[model samples]
Target: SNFGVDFVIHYKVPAAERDEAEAGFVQLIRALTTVGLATEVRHGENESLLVFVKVSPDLFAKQVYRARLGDWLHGVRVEAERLRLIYLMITKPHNEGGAGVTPTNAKWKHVESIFPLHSHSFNKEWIKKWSSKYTLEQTDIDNIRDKFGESVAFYFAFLRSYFRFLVIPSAFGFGAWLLLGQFSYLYALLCGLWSVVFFEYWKKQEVDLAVQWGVRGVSSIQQSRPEFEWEHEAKVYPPMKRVKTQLLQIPFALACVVALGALIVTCNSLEVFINEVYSGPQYLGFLPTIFLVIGTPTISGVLMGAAEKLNAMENYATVDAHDAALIQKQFVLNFMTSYMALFFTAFVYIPFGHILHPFLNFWRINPARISNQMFYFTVTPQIVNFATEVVVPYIKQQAFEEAEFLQRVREECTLEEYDVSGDYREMVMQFGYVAMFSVAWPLAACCFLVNNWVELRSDALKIAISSRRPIPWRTDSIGPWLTALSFLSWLGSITSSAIVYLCSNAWGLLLSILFAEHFYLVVQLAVRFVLSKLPGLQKERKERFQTKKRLLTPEEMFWQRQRGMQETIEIGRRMIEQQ
Candidate 1:
């Protein structure tokens, strides 16, 4: 039953108080050992103690199930009891049937971190299992839930489902690109229809997965985040107050939108000026592109910092609301900055570049040449993004860990903590790129498909070997990223249509644009109608309805049973009175 190093809790104390703190540390260690937890301590960064606690595997497993049951009874609603079990143990306090130790109510001033133990062997086996197959099953997702918790598992589930569904459109797109060419109206129409269809299908898939994992409407039961600090105390759910606070956020949201629009416009105008008007040197052509690549993250980071401050000022009551607002702002900014170039290039620059060419006169502007350059620029960024976001970070972390491991052998230092948020953001960004621009480059999806295959395994290695074990967080879906993907798909339809009309010799240029737009609208409606009639989802929907009807709390059951008993007694008394 022993999990031999189940978790590590970090405690920090001032160096001046080391002697006094050592006594307290001894008491804390004794408290844990008294509860039948095996313990080990190592010095951490600054004057800190990293206490590793181990419990019997059977006991740990029991606590996991108990936590799951608590979640279910609290109305979190999941069909699968086994899902997100480890996460509950990793985050919950020891007194609450978990492996975690906290600073609050314990003899400690600062609890810097609480992390679960990583299983290198388990992670390696999982990576191997998933890598060997192109298709993933429900069992695969379930296994992810068992190890990583629902939040991380949801992303993998999404990627798996998306990859499977992509095959249909990807194959069609490749064939069309090969035979009909890049600007084929037929290809554009098909891709547009496919975008809408895929979005609709994925919505249903997310709901189905949520139900399967027993997390449909899980947000209702989530506790407020530890970091949340309320502006005012409220004894009950303050609906009107919350509504007012949300309403206050409207102006801030609008400000962000306007700022993002301005940035995108400025970037586009600069590119136009540099390429068209300012012909100072031959080397200057690449300047605009270089600026966009470097300046985007710099500006975005500042914007994100401002958005976080704005979110704080708005004073959301819970972490969910705070995160949702912040991510929404981030999504808009990211979408605009990331895809505005492609948008301007397809819709304006390419189609109208000829008209502006004569006016500029400083340089010769070739639309075809520009289009070719844009294509290369688009594809190359994906590789750069993969390397910088995924590859470089992994290498750096591995090197740090290797150095730390050697230092531990000689001097004994605490391990580095894992932060999964960056990894999550990277994947979300990749999703946006693939969804929006894949139509322009039919091979985009194929490239991403391969990248994801490596990404899945590489990330596993990073988490298992390089980083500290993350506290499992529960999530029913991929949050705002799903909304971001949906938005990208909608934009993709328009972009794809525009590119086909402007760049290709399909129909007359104006006619192609008009027809492609109309065709997309008509096909979207038809696809929705067809998808609505699918029998598999219909049956699942029916089952979900039935399941909801059957789910009753103990209090509800008690009332219902008592009502029946009273009715039976009244009926018997009536019969006696008649006799």
Candidate 2:
């Protein structure tokens, strides 16, 4: 069978050179093909080419690399004349009228529907018939040069791609702000919906890029590492052997989970103490929250670094990428979890504790004296503490980082830098206000909703300047799952709020709520411990079992066949007697 050929080229070249390059490559391919010699060339922006051919699938597959090499040779000739180029290939079935189609061709409509290459009728037909398709139509080409000009066009294109990310968030933020005041339930709802949508869209976006770049299945296609050495390869009686390796990451994940849980618990305890005990100096009020926030990330980085080392030592080829990514993602999740937990305990929980549990036991004695207004006042400190801890620090960090990065860029480059839009910062700060305030005041959640709209845009800018490379999280990966787990955090927060609002009137119910929350968290840690053991068991079972193929997964198929072949020779004493 034969697969057809299609090439999409993006280039910067003068019309004459572009024409010569395309024609030269086409003539070479036309000469190489067997009897079914068909060729189609389509024109693209700035002297680019979309060329296609219909031929035997087997022949095409066997010779496509050679054909590409020939094109590269022609590309060298064009480059000698000082032209720039970039291109990619797409393969499809031969029945679609091959590569390029004329208006008279049966597949022309289908081809045109799929790829809208040219607007002008004459240029379109010229592309369909001729080997080379040039951008130079004299008048229109001159208009492109004179009206917009190359420098303006280049800058606009760059900005267009760069700034396109802001559109969705900006629109959503504006709409939310218009409808809900800062920190409203409506705002939280909008934000939750927006986060889900953005995450889903990004998943699809990654898929599209992977497909276009021809790297969609690259992970699955990679070879096993030569360094990998099996302790035991299982063998069955008349055939298969189970393949085994020791690169499992469940141990590392277990270690990380334990360390992170301890970190969160310790941080939460520290925050609770600082908030409830020891009336400190006035300036020290913000110190605990700030320390927790900063410390959580530092701990996470350390944890991830350790996990990376373990992953590398395990000696699996792609497992390093997989485990390292999971470790980093889990660490981030833990950091965020710890930060949120500390914030609530230090600022919200402690303050509320003092108010609700005020004891007038002895004459001017018990520090635990309680009153309704006093409790509310205690909780009030959380609003102030969070403003200092989360809001102030986040804003300062983004501003400082952006300024420093841009200054370095300016020092290195002679080109002028563009001014940032003021709307971006205003948007992010507004989000911080709402997220921070939502606990004490429901009305503040509305601000969270509105601010998130701007928050997304601000995050995009921060990401642009940051040293961190955004991990393309997988469905099974910790990063994306942690995002889902954030909803669980929200649920916990809502439950805590409900207890504070409804049960705070009764001391007994408040005590029960606290006990239950603490117990549940402890139980969750235990469950994670139990769950982590299963992966190792699964790995061991898979390594030992040597069942024959009723059905086989792709990974099992290749390894089982190779192992079975080796085992068969070892088991067989003689060639089947007189068969």
Query: Best-fitting candidate, measured by lDDT?
Result: 1
- The local distance difference test score of model 1 is 0.62
The sequence of per-residue lDDT tens digits that candidate 2 reaches over residues 103-214 is 2222222122121111133333433432242212334322222322222222222222223433443455455446643323343343333333433433444443333322
State, as a TM-score between 0 and 1, how close model 2 is to the true structure.
0.34
Candidate models: Cα lDDT each: 0.62, 0.35
Query: How many clashing pairs in candidate 2?
Result: 23
- TM-score of each candidate structure, all chains considered together: 0.72, 0.34
Candidate closest to the true structure, highest TM-score: 1
RMSD of each candidate relative to the true structure: 9.7, 22.1
Candidate 2, residue 269: Cα displacement in angstroms equals: 5.2
Candidate 1: where are CA atoms >4 Å away? 1-3, 14-40, 54-69, 74-109, 130-138, 235-291, 294-306, 351-365, 394-436, 504-532, 535-579
